[PDB]
Design a binder for this molecule. Structure first.
Ligand SMILES: [Zn+2]
Ligand SMILES: [Zn+2]
Ligand SMILES: [Zn+2]
Length: 117
């Protein structure tokens, strides 16, 4: 049963996590890609996964493997609350159960519930 490399969950609800993408030997939710806090987009649009290069995605999985999700208490949390004085990290699906807010513009920031702008 395939899982997203960034949140470690199954395809789930595409309205909440985006389409489940499979390319370059990787599986990832589209929103996990665009909301991942420190993921560079260094490719042209027809490269990698919409310009997100497989190497960078994997490096982002590695960075996140050292971060604990405040919701489920497991490693692999790739999203960080973007309030400057907050250290909460979370998997996207987990954050969505606890009122975390994601923005789909600009730096594509997310916030924990206490820091919703
Ligand atoms: Zn995901
Ligand atoms: Zn989690
Ligand atoms: Zn916060």
């Amino acid at each position: 049963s395939p899982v997203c490399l960034l949140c470690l969950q199954e395809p789930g609800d595409p309205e909440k996590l985006g389409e489940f993408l499979q390319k370059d030997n990787l599986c990832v939710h589209y929103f996990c890609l665009i909301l991942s806090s420190r993921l560079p987009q260094k490719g042209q649009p027809n490269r990698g996964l919409h310009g997100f290069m497989p190497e960078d995605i994997k490096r982002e999985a590695v960075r996140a493997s050292k971060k604990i999700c405040f919701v489920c208490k497991k490693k692999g949390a790739a999203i960080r609350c973007q309030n400057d004085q907050c250290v909460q990290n979370f998997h996207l699906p987990c954050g969505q159960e606890r009122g975390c807010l994601s923005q789909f513009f600009g730096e594509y920031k997310s916030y924990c519930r206490k820091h919703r702008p």
